[PDB]
Amino acid sequence: SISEKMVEALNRQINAEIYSAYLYLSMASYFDSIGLKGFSNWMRVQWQEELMHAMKMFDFVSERGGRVKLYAVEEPPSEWDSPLAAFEHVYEHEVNVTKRIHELVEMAMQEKDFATYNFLQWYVAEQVEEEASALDIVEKLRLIGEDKRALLFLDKELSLRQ
């Protein structure tokens, strides 16, 4: 029954989801600059999805009678060494988001805030996919190496994402 500490922690996480969106938008611009439009498209859809994660939590906080406060969204990095390094960064970033969602879950249960626990279980399950989807692309890119035809094949797969 929503505490100030919970609302603050969720507002910080709204900020981290928007930051996640903006990181991937910056990667969209990186992949565009190196001609990989399929990879770009993947990042743009991820930036759309992260903003939906944020908005789902924005509505939740407000539905619970809490007040959403918005914080600065930081300037994201703009360059990566390669496609592999970008997706390794996606994976480590998402692993980190996972850690934060788990601390939120533990904070909810500590306060016996069952509505927040139940609402967060959606993110727990979405984090499982985020990490697996990023990891699978890291592994493909590791196999691919410098094979250009394979890089383009993957770029076409990623094109299809909606």
Segment 154-162 long-range contacts (CB within 8 Å, at least 24 positions apart): 154/38, 155/36, 155/37, 155/38, 155/39, 156/38, 157/38, 158/38, 158/39, 158/41, 158/42, 159/37, 159/38, 159/41, 159/42, 160/38, 161/41, 161/42, 161/45, 162/45
The listed partner (Zn ion, a second copy, none) that binds 130, CB under 5 to 8 Å by sort, is: Zn ion
Decide: is 114 part of the binding site for a second copy (CB under 8 A): yes
The listed partner (a second copy, Zn ion, none) that binds 88, CB under 5 to 8 Å by sort, is: none
Burial class (CB in 10 A: 0-12, 13-18, 19+), 99: exposed
Distance spanning both ends of the chain, measured CA to CA: 37
The listed partner (a second copy, Zn ion, none) that binds 24, CB under 5 to 8 Å by sort, is: none
Find out whether 151 and 32 touch, Cβ atoms under 8 Å. Answer: no
**Which residues from 31-90 bind a second copy, rule CB under 8 A?**
32-37, 51, 58, 62-65, 67-76, 78
For a second copy, give the closer residue by CB, 102 or 161: 102
Decide: is 131 part of the binding site for Zn ion (CB under 5 A): no
Q: Which residues are annotated as a binding site?
A: 17, 49-50, 53, 94, 126, 129-130
Site residues, a second copy (CB under 8 A): 1, 22, 25-26, 29, 32-37, 51, 58, 62-65, 67-76, 78, 95, 98, 102, 105-106, 109, 112-115, 117-119, 121, 124-125, 127-129, 131-132, 135-136, 139-140, 143-145, 147-150, 152-157
